[PDB]
Amino acid sequence: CTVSNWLAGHESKPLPNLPKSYRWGLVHWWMGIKDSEFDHFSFVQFFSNWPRSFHSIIEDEVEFNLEHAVVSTSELRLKDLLGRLFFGSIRLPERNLQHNIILGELLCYLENRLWQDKGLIANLKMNALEATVMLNCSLDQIASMVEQRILKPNDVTDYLFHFGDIFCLWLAEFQSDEFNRSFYVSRW
Amino acid sequence: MFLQRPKPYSDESLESFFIRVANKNGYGDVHRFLEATKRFLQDIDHNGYQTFPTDITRINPYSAKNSSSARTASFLKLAQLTFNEPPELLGLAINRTNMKYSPSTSAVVRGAEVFPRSLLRTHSIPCCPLCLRENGYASYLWHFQGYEYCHSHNVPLITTCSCGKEFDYRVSEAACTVSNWLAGHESKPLPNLPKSYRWGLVHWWMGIKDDHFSFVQFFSNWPRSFHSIIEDEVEFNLEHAVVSTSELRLKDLLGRLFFGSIRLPERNLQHNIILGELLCYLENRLWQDKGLIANLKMNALEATVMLNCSLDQIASMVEQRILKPNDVTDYLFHFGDIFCLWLAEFQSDEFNRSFYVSR
Amino acid sequence: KLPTNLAYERSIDPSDVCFFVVWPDDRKTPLTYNSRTPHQVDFCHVPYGASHIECSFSVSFSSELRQPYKCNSSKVKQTLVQLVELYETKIGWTELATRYLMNICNGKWLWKNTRKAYCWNIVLTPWPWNGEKVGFEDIRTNYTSRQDFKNNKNWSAIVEMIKTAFSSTDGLAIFEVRATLHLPTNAMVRPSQVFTEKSRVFQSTTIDGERSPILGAFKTGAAIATIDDWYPEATEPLRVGRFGVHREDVTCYRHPSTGKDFFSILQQAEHYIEVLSPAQETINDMHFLMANLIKGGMFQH
Amino acid sequence: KWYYKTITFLPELCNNESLAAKCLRVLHGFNYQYETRNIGVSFPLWCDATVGKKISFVSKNKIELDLLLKQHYFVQMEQLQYFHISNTVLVPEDCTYVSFRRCQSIDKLTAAGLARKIRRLEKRALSRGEQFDPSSFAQKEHTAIAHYHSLGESSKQTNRNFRLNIRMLSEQPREGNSIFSSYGLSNSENSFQPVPL
């Protein structure tokens, strides 16, 4: 009954309120993580401990695949350090993170946790096409970044780029008025 | 280490932020702290210190071809471990972006707002005292913001303003409404559209006119002005058809109005009501005659600006028999069929139909 | 233009650098390293109990830029003789001599051996000279901008005697240079490395019988020549070459598509006699033209 | 009558040092709760360059080797199948025969380690007489070190990235009736105990 009465636009209970086009993406995000039907009891419980129990599950999962990492503490892709948290919360339906704050707090964790533990987060290795998925560009625009040296490397599929290199790249080249990072400066 | 008490408030173009941390503790200009920053960048745990600038200007993170990605990384740890209570530093940076407009002008993001072109003045600007200091100068039209008659070009003697020659760029009624409109107020005669669309449409008036009294005459009759400018320019270029007498191709019928008002800069129908009203007058009159609006010649290259493609979905749509062939560079298809499959399979939540008339 | 045989000789003559370890009892020994093993890897460090580390080289400022070395043609002869002779009058040797001297003064020739240092001091020994040893003490916290050098007691004479060494025919100026580096205990020293066309094999020499690293003579000639920031939208000073090559990233600026390399300015020599007979960019590329004739090189096709 | 637990180190992108240490760090948490001395080293696919896949676990009391094997690591790495349990089989008494011992001489060869050494020789000669100098203490030019397959390890108590150094010695058919230690050894205070691999 709770998840019923804030679908048609009713702005009265402390469950979080969105322009309810974005709310179906929040419904779709709950089914993708749990890998089941859209549960209701823990859905109220997860948003009743918001945003305190959110960052704990973020912390317990980055501890999970780093304690049980397969290769090493370095020379790794961003898989098995952010495996399902990053690839499963991109486009619901748009990255306007004032609206979908599941990306506004995910990219808050990507800001405040860059350069600790001798660059443990800044040595995640990426390929070229993740910039086409994350930063909303094409493969031909990446080749313009290499020839005029704005992106500095260190093929589409080969893993060649770096994380602190690419996080400070989109604050300088790939930041639109809708996709800003300043939208959560009063949340953390 | 430990820059004591970062004070400041909003509405600043980041250049006086280094000046306000210069006037504390007793320091000459900004070459010392600005070297001691890049010395601290040359110090522990850093890799990109070589390109952090040297002069009064160029702290701007678009002044280099490729140190843009190095300037923000420089600005990352320039707030955290050098300030007690790390202030609002990031987001003040006037960056660059990937966006453009329709007249091919470079877009430029400050924190959420887009200037028309990255050209505006950059040198020899007026300045007014008794603040610290502004956000809006070094631009085309931002003069007074409440207190007027303050140009302050320094033909008389040195040191009129009491700052210490840091920012201080000086060498030896309808304007008050638009100045309050670009600074951000209620502005009751104006329909309260954000500053990405405010500066986004000043050039749109500057582009079609090639002037504050000529500015407000287009906005004093705002529910009449766009409807009147679209009905007297549609009768133009009708006797100058190209094929025989009608069925006019691209670039000759509204080739300036339609290719000048699309995505300036963001595709929102809530605030940018230009896109909804040009869609209104063009398509409240769908089938007037045989070949007047819908039955014309269109190209697939100028169709992806509405369909949001990158010439990769066209190889899966026309072979799936949605758009019937009646080819990349020819004026082949028609405007009525391309727009309707856009409405049937290329909608959104904010770039959609349910925002214009009827309200 | 460029008539198939033209060459200049260089006008700055640096030598190798030598590393000595001074003890607390005012005794100096050569700094010797270790080798570990085809595959061979070298390791160098400050020995425990040492006070600091000394470095000494020498550099000369001669006048081989007035006429070429081989010229092949008496139309590129009197043109390039007149350009260097008109640059002496209208512009002056001030803006070049100050830039070359500061990279000698502020320890730029110590490449990455200044990182994590407490204090370092640099003492010149000019010749011909009537007076005193010149000092530059605690350079990190006392000398950082063009103006800290200009407050010195002995900057008016050492910007001088290089200006005469380029202006007068058969001129000469010789500088002995000494530096002392106060590095922490068991600190790593970074000399030059042997090429070894395909690790970290040191370039060594024999000083007082035992081997010691050098940090090169072409390595320390590159550090003094980094005065180039006239490539468009310049953020960092580069080393003077014909195509503005940057080393760390493997791009290059100054490309001939831009129109700003040397061979598209050297062909325009007759154009610039007219203006010098203008302070916007016709000056800012003759600083690149003069720094190529001081460099040397064969200019021929 | 020893046992062996052959592991399989499959997924084709993996480090040989970080996984031979973490499978030994979960042995290092052992012998601080159930304090025994009986579990060995035994690499079957030791080679010269880029050591291979298999490791084993050898003991004569031979029931703690399954008690060690269920200690919140294979019960935590089970489904994404990195490794699997062997068949807990008696070792046949004719096989190859090696020894694993911590060398520890290599750790005191690095330039920081020799300054760690001559600092200690400075103070323990407090019986006076001479007034010696640190000038007559040097490593000369030449130390030829072939291969030792180092294994990095973080300290339990504090934040130190220390390291181990163990090589191969294959002879001497009788020493060490299961007198191993915390890491598994053949050098310190007991014997030079060999391993049946």
PDB file of N, CA and C in Angstrom, chain B residues 157-229:
ATOM      1  N   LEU B 157      43.788  59.709 -11.983  1.00  0.00           N
ATOM      2  CA  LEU B 157      44.934  59.157 -11.258  1.00  0.00           C
ATOM      3  C   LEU B 157      44.772  57.719 -10.767  1.00  0.00           C
ATOM      4  N   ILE B 158      45.895  57.126 -10.365  1.00  0.00           N
ATOM      5  CA  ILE B 158      46.006  55.712 -10.027  1.00  0.00           C
ATOM      6  C   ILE B 158      45.359  55.470  -8.663  1.00  0.00           C
ATOM      7  N   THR B 159      44.847  54.246  -8.465  1.00  0.00           N
ATOM      8  CA  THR B 159      44.311  53.714  -7.204  1.00  0.00           C
ATOM      9  C   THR B 159      43.091  54.519  -6.738  1.00  0.00           C
ATOM     10  N   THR B 160      42.026  54.377  -7.528  1.00  0.00           N
ATOM     11  CA  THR B 160      40.698  54.826  -7.130  1.00  0.00           C
ATOM     12  C   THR B 160      39.981  53.762  -6.301  1.00  0.00           C
ATOM     13  N   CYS B 161      39.955  52.524  -6.790  1.00  0.00           N
ATOM     14  CA  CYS B 161      39.365  51.410  -6.059  1.00  0.00           C
ATOM     15  C   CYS B 161      40.375  50.836  -5.075  1.00  0.00           C
ATOM     16  N   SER B 162      39.884  50.431  -3.903  1.00  0.00           N
ATOM     17  CA  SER B 162      40.742  49.965  -2.815  1.00  0.00           C
ATOM     18  C   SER B 162      40.768  48.439  -2.805  1.00  0.00           C
ATOM     19  N   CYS B 163      41.533  47.873  -3.728  1.00  0.00           N
ATOM     20  CA  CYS B 163      41.791  46.437  -3.686  1.00  0.00           C
ATOM     21  C   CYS B 163      43.273  46.099  -3.737  1.00  0.00           C
ATOM     22  N   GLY B 164      44.055  46.799  -4.557  1.00  0.00           N
ATOM     23  CA  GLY B 164      45.478  46.529  -4.658  1.00  0.00           C
ATOM     24  C   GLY B 164      45.938  45.977  -5.994  1.00  0.00           C
ATOM     25  N   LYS B 165      45.259  46.387  -7.076  1.00  0.00           N
ATOM     26  CA  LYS B 165      45.625  46.087  -8.470  1.00  0.00           C
ATOM     27  C   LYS B 165      45.638  44.590  -8.778  1.00  0.00           C
ATOM     28  N   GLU B 166      44.788  43.807  -8.112  1.00  0.00           N
ATOM     29  CA  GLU B 166      44.748  42.372  -8.400  1.00  0.00           C
ATOM     30  C   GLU B 166      43.847  42.063  -9.593  1.00  0.00           C
ATOM     31  N   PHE B 167      42.542  42.318  -9.463  1.00  0.00           N
ATOM     32  CA  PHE B 167      41.617  42.053 -10.572  1.00  0.00           C
ATOM     33  C   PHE B 167      41.530  43.295 -11.449  1.00  0.00           C
ATOM     34  N   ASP B 168      40.900  44.351 -10.911  1.00  0.00           N
ATOM     35  CA  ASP B 168      41.054  45.781 -11.191  1.00  0.00           C
ATOM     36  C   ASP B 168      41.394  46.166 -12.628  1.00  0.00           C
ATOM     37  N   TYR B 169      40.650  45.628 -13.591  1.00  0.00           N
ATOM     38  CA  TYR B 169      40.936  45.862 -15.004  1.00  0.00           C
ATOM     39  C   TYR B 169      40.535  47.285 -15.369  1.00  0.00           C
ATOM     40  N   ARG B 170      41.503  48.197 -15.316  1.00  0.00           N
ATOM     41  CA  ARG B 170      41.294  49.580 -15.711  1.00  0.00           C
ATOM     42  C   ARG B 170      42.613  50.138 -16.230  1.00  0.00           C
ATOM     43  N   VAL B 171      42.534  50.907 -17.316  1.00  0.00           N
ATOM     44  CA  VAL B 171      43.714  51.424 -17.993  1.00  0.00           C
ATOM     45  C   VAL B 171      43.649  52.946 -18.019  1.00  0.00           C
ATOM     46  N   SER B 172      44.807  53.555 -18.256  1.00  0.00           N
ATOM     47  CA  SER B 172      44.915  55.008 -18.323  1.00  0.00           C
ATOM     48  C   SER B 172      45.513  55.451 -19.654  1.00  0.00           C
ATOM     49  N   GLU B 173      13.505  53.128 -19.765  1.00  0.00           N
ATOM     50  CA  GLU B 173      14.722  52.384 -19.464  1.00  0.00           C
ATOM     51  C   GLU B 173      14.497  50.884 -19.615  1.00  0.00           C
ATOM     52  N   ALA B 174      15.280  50.258 -20.493  1.00  0.00           N
ATOM     53  CA  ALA B 174      15.177  48.830 -20.745  1.00  0.00           C
ATOM     54  C   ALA B 174      16.446  48.056 -20.421  1.00  0.00           C
ATOM     55  N   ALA B 175      17.556  48.737 -20.128  1.00  0.00           N
ATOM     56  CA  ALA B 175      18.797  48.040 -19.819  1.00  0.00           C
ATOM     57  C   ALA B 175      18.810  47.487 -18.400  1.00  0.00           C
ATOM     58  N   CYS B 176      18.005  48.056 -17.500  1.00  0.00           N
ATOM     59  CA  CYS B 176      17.984  47.576 -16.122  1.00  0.00           C
ATOM     60  C   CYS B 176      17.182  46.287 -15.994  1.00  0.00           C
ATOM     61  N   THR B 177      16.216  46.073 -16.891  1.00  0.00           N
ATOM     62  CA  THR B 177      15.418  44.852 -16.843  1.00  0.00           C
ATOM     63  C   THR B 177      16.211  43.657 -17.360  1.00  0.00           C
ATOM     64  N   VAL B 178      16.940  43.838 -18.464  1.00  0.00           N
ATOM     65  CA  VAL B 178      17.718  42.747 -19.041  1.00  0.00           C
ATOM     66  C   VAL B 178      18.954  42.445 -18.189  1.00  0.00           C
ATOM     67  N   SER B 179      19.461  43.437 -17.447  1.00  0.00           N
ATOM     68  CA  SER B 179      20.576  43.179 -16.540  1.00  0.00           C
ATOM     69  C   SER B 179      20.120  42.389 -15.321  1.00  0.00           C
ATOM     70  N   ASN B 180      18.905  42.656 -14.838  1.00  0.00           N
ATOM     71  CA  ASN B 180      18.339  41.844 -13.767  1.00  0.00           C
ATOM     72  C   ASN B 180      17.891  40.481 -14.280  1.00  0.00           C
ATOM     73  N   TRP B 181      17.624  40.371 -15.584  1.00  0.00           N
ATOM     74  CA  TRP B 181      17.221  39.094 -16.162  1.00  0.00           C
ATOM     75  C   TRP B 181      18.411  38.151 -16.292  1.00  0.00           C
ATOM     76  N   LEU B 182      19.568  38.679 -16.688  1.00  0.00           N
ATOM     77  CA  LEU B 182      20.760  37.855 -16.833  1.00  0.00           C
ATOM     78  C   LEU B 182      21.484  37.617 -15.514  1.00  0.00           C
ATOM     79  N   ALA B 183      21.179  38.392 -14.473  1.00  0.00           N
ATOM     80  CA  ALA B 183      21.738  38.147 -13.150  1.00  0.00           C
ATOM     81  C   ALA B 183      20.877  37.203 -12.322  1.00  0.00           C
ATOM     82  N   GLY B 184      19.590  37.097 -12.643  1.00  0.00           N
ATOM     83  CA  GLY B 184      18.699  36.171 -11.973  1.00  0.00           C
ATOM     84  C   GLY B 184      17.772  36.823 -10.969  1.00  0.00           C
ATOM     85  N   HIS B 185      16.541  37.086 -11.393  1.00  0.00           N
ATOM     86  CA  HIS B 185      15.495  37.661 -10.550  1.00  0.00           C
ATOM     87  C   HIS B 185      14.160  37.084 -11.013  1.00  0.00           C
ATOM     88  N   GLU B 186      13.060  37.702 -10.581  1.00  0.00           N
ATOM     89  CA  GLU B 186      11.741  37.230 -10.992  1.00  0.00           C
ATOM     90  C   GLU B 186      11.434  37.643 -12.426  1.00  0.00           C
ATOM     91  N   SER B 187      11.525  38.951 -12.710  1.00  0.00           N
ATOM     92  CA  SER B 187      11.379  39.551 -14.044  1.00  0.00           C
ATOM     93  C   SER B 187      10.006  39.238 -14.653  1.00  0.00           C
ATOM     94  N   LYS B 188       8.990  39.853 -14.038  1.00  0.00           N
ATOM     95  CA  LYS B 188       7.583  39.634 -14.394  1.00  0.00           C
ATOM     96  C   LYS B 188       7.211  39.760 -15.880  1.00  0.00           C
ATOM     97  N   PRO B 189       7.765  40.674 -16.700  1.00  0.00           N
ATOM     98  CA  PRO B 189       7.440  40.613 -18.139  1.00  0.00           C
ATOM     99  C   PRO B 189       8.094  39.459 -18.890  1.00  0.00           C
ATOM    100  N   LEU B 190       9.007  38.710 -18.269  1.00  0.00           N
ATOM    101  CA  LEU B 190       9.724  37.651 -18.959  1.00  0.00           C
ATOM    102  C   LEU B 190       9.343  36.279 -18.400  1.00  0.00           C
ATOM    103  N   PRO B 191       9.285  35.234 -19.230  1.00  0.00           N
ATOM    104  CA  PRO B 191       8.640  33.979 -18.815  1.00  0.00           C
ATOM    105  C   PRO B 191       9.479  33.066 -17.931  1.00  0.00           C
ATOM    106  N   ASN B 192      10.567  33.572 -17.334  1.00  0.00           N
ATOM    107  CA  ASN B 192      11.368  32.886 -16.310  1.00  0.00           C
ATOM    108  C   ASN B 192      11.962  31.574 -16.837  1.00  0.00           C
ATOM    109  N   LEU B 193      12.839  31.714 -17.822  1.00  0.00           N
ATOM    110  CA  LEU B 193      13.615  30.627 -18.396  1.00  0.00           C
ATOM    111  C   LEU B 193      15.070  30.708 -17.925  1.00  0.00           C
ATOM    112  N   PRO B 194      15.740  29.570 -17.710  1.00  0.00           N
ATOM    113  CA  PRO B 194      17.045  29.590 -17.030  1.00  0.00           C
ATOM    114  C   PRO B 194      18.158  30.143 -17.909  1.00  0.00           C
ATOM    115  N   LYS B 195      19.322  30.338 -17.273  1.00  0.00           N
ATOM    116  CA  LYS B 195      20.389  31.139 -17.870  1.00  0.00           C
ATOM    117  C   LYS B 195      21.115  30.408 -18.993  1.00  0.00           C
ATOM    118  N   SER B 196      20.914  29.095 -19.123  1.00  0.00           N
ATOM    119  CA  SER B 196      21.382  28.400 -20.317  1.00  0.00           C
ATOM    120  C   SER B 196      20.565  28.818 -21.533  1.00  0.00           C
ATOM    121  N   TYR B 197      19.287  29.138 -21.316  1.00  0.00           N
ATOM    122  CA  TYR B 197      18.430  29.596 -22.403  1.00  0.00           C
ATOM    123  C   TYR B 197      18.412  31.115 -22.503  1.00  0.00           C
ATOM    124  N   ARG B 198      18.803  31.813 -21.433  1.00  0.00           N
ATOM    125  CA  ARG B 198      18.881  33.271 -21.478  1.00  0.00           C
ATOM    126  C   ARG B 198      19.988  33.720 -22.419  1.00  0.00           C
ATOM    127  N   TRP B 199      21.225  33.301 -22.139  1.00  0.00           N
ATOM    128  CA  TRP B 199      22.323  33.576 -23.058  1.00  0.00           C
ATOM    129  C   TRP B 199      22.206  32.754 -24.335  1.00  0.00           C
ATOM    130  N   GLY B 200      21.491  31.626 -24.285  1.00  0.00           N
ATOM    131  CA  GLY B 200      21.322  30.812 -25.477  1.00  0.00           C
ATOM    132  C   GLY B 200      20.473  31.482 -26.541  1.00  0.00           C
ATOM    133  N   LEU B 201      19.611  32.417 -26.134  1.00  0.00           N
ATOM    134  CA  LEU B 201      18.730  33.080 -27.086  1.00  0.00           C
ATOM    135  C   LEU B 201      19.097  34.539 -27.335  1.00  0.00           C
ATOM    136  N   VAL B 202      20.050  35.099 -26.582  1.00  0.00           N
ATOM    137  CA  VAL B 202      20.571  36.426 -26.908  1.00  0.00           C
ATOM    138  C   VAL B 202      21.328  36.384 -28.232  1.00  0.00           C
ATOM    139  N   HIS B 203      22.156  35.353 -28.424  1.00  0.00           N
ATOM    140  CA  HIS B 203      22.809  35.163 -29.714  1.00  0.00           C
ATOM    141  C   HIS B 203      21.812  34.789 -30.803  1.00  0.00           C
ATOM    142  N   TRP B 204      20.707  34.131 -30.435  1.00  0.00           N
ATOM    143  CA  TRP B 204      19.663  33.823 -31.408  1.00  0.00           C
ATOM    144  C   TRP B 204      19.003  35.093 -31.930  1.00  0.00           C
ATOM    145  N   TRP B 205      18.911  36.126 -31.090  1.00  0.00           N
ATOM    146  CA  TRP B 205      18.506  37.437 -31.583  1.00  0.00           C
ATOM    147  C   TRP B 205      19.665  38.148 -32.273  1.00  0.00           C
ATOM    148  N   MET B 206      20.902  37.858 -31.859  1.00  0.00           N
ATOM    149  CA  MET B 206      22.062  38.460 -32.507  1.00  0.00           C
ATOM    150  C   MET B 206      22.360  37.794 -33.845  1.00  0.00           C
ATOM    151  N   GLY B 207      22.052  36.505 -33.975  1.00  0.00           N
ATOM    152  CA  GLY B 207      22.298  35.787 -35.210  1.00  0.00           C
ATOM    153  C   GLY B 207      21.351  36.159 -36.334  1.00  0.00           C
ATOM    154  N   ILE B 208      20.075  36.381 -36.004  1.00  0.00           N
ATOM    155  CA  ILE B 208      19.091  36.742 -37.023  1.00  0.00           C
ATOM    156  C   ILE B 208      19.124  38.219 -37.380  1.00  0.00           C
ATOM    157  N   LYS B 209      19.835  39.037 -36.611  1.00  0.00           N
ATOM    158  CA  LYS B 209      19.946  40.473 -36.858  1.00  0.00           C
ATOM    159  C   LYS B 209      21.397  40.755 -37.235  1.00  0.00           C
ATOM    160  N   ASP B 210      21.665  40.835 -38.535  1.00  0.00           N
ATOM    161  CA  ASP B 210      23.013  41.098 -39.026  1.00  0.00           C
ATOM    162  C   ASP B 210      22.974  41.794 -40.382  1.00  0.00           C
ATOM    163  N   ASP B 211      21.587  47.198 -28.531  1.00  0.00           N
ATOM    164  CA  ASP B 211      20.237  47.142 -29.083  1.00  0.00           C
ATOM    165  C   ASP B 211      19.199  46.721 -28.039  1.00  0.00           C
ATOM    166  N   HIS B 212      19.248  47.365 -26.869  1.00  0.00           N
ATOM    167  CA  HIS B 212      18.342  47.004 -25.782  1.00  0.00           C
ATOM    168  C   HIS B 212      16.914  47.463 -26.055  1.00  0.00           C
ATOM    169  N   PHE B 213      16.739  48.525 -26.846  1.00  0.00           N
ATOM    170  CA  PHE B 213      15.393  48.921 -27.245  1.00  0.00           C
ATOM    171  C   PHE B 213      14.842  47.979 -28.307  1.00  0.00           C
ATOM    172  N   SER B 214      15.709  47.484 -29.194  1.00  0.00           N
ATOM    173  CA  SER B 214      15.304  46.453 -30.142  1.00  0.00           C
ATOM    174  C   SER B 214      15.215  45.082 -29.487  1.00  0.00           C
ATOM    175  N   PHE B 215      15.768  44.930 -28.282  1.00  0.00           N
ATOM    176  CA  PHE B 215      15.667  43.663 -27.566  1.00  0.00           C
ATOM    177  C   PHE B 215      14.277  43.483 -26.970  1.00  0.00           C
ATOM    178  N   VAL B 216      13.809  44.474 -26.203  1.00  0.00           N
ATOM    179  CA  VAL B 216      12.569  44.331 -25.441  1.00  0.00           C
ATOM    180  C   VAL B 216      11.312  44.449 -26.286  1.00  0.00           C
ATOM    181  N   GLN B 217      11.416  44.917 -27.533  1.00  0.00           N
ATOM    182  CA  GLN B 217      10.243  44.943 -28.401  1.00  0.00           C
ATOM    183  C   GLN B 217       9.851  43.547 -28.869  1.00  0.00           C
ATOM    184  N   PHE B 218      10.794  42.605 -28.873  1.00  0.00           N
ATOM    185  CA  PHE B 218      10.487  41.208 -29.149  1.00  0.00           C
ATOM    186  C   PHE B 218       9.936  40.494 -27.918  1.00  0.00           C
ATOM    187  N   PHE B 219      10.121  41.067 -26.729  1.00  0.00           N
ATOM    188  CA  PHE B 219       9.689  40.444 -25.487  1.00  0.00           C
ATOM    189  C   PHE B 219       8.522  41.151 -24.812  1.00  0.00           C
ATOM    190  N   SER B 220       8.133  42.341 -25.281  1.00  0.00           N
ATOM    191  CA  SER B 220       6.971  43.015 -24.708  1.00  0.00           C
ATOM    192  C   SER B 220       5.669  42.373 -25.171  1.00  0.00           C
ATOM    193  N   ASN B 221       5.681  41.745 -26.344  1.00  0.00           N
ATOM    194  CA  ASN B 221       4.530  41.026 -26.876  1.00  0.00           C
ATOM    195  C   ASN B 221       4.882  39.557 -27.081  1.00  0.00           C
ATOM    196  N   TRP B 222       5.471  38.954 -26.045  1.00  0.00           N
ATOM    197  CA  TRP B 222       5.995  37.588 -26.129  1.00  0.00           C
ATOM    198  C   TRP B 222       4.990  36.492 -26.512  1.00  0.00           C
ATOM    199  N   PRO B 223       3.709  36.509 -26.126  1.00  0.00           N
ATOM    200  CA  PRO B 223       2.759  35.581 -26.756  1.00  0.00           C
ATOM    201  C   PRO B 223       2.248  36.013 -28.124  1.00  0.00           C
ATOM    202  N   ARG B 224       2.851  37.018 -28.758  1.00  0.00           N
ATOM    203  CA  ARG B 224       2.414  37.474 -30.072  1.00  0.00           C
ATOM    204  C   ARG B 224       3.611  37.599 -31.010  1.00  0.00           C
ATOM    205  N   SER B 225       4.807  37.788 -30.444  1.00  0.00           N
ATOM    206  CA  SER B 225       5.975  38.141 -31.251  1.00  0.00           C
ATOM    207  C   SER B 225       6.480  36.957 -32.065  1.00  0.00           C
ATOM    208  N   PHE B 226       6.562  35.776 -31.448  1.00  0.00           N
ATOM    209  CA  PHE B 226       7.050  34.612 -32.179  1.00  0.00           C
ATOM    210  C   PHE B 226       6.008  34.112 -33.171  1.00  0.00           C
ATOM    211  N   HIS B 227       4.725  34.345 -32.884  1.00  0.00           N
ATOM    212  CA  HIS B 227       3.674  33.947 -33.815  1.00  0.00           C
ATOM    213  C   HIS B 227       3.575  34.916 -34.987  1.00  0.00           C
ATOM    214  N   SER B 228       4.048  36.152 -34.808  1.00  0.00           N
ATOM    215  CA  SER B 228       4.002  37.119 -35.901  1.00  0.00           C
ATOM    216  C   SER B 228       5.255  37.041 -36.766  1.00  0.00           C
ATOM    217  N   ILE B 229       6.385  36.635 -36.181  1.00  0.00           N
ATOM    218  CA  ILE B 229       7.620  36.552 -36.955  1.00  0.00           C
ATOM    219  C   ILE B 229       7.645  35.266 -37.782  1.00  0.00           C
TER     220      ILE B 229
END
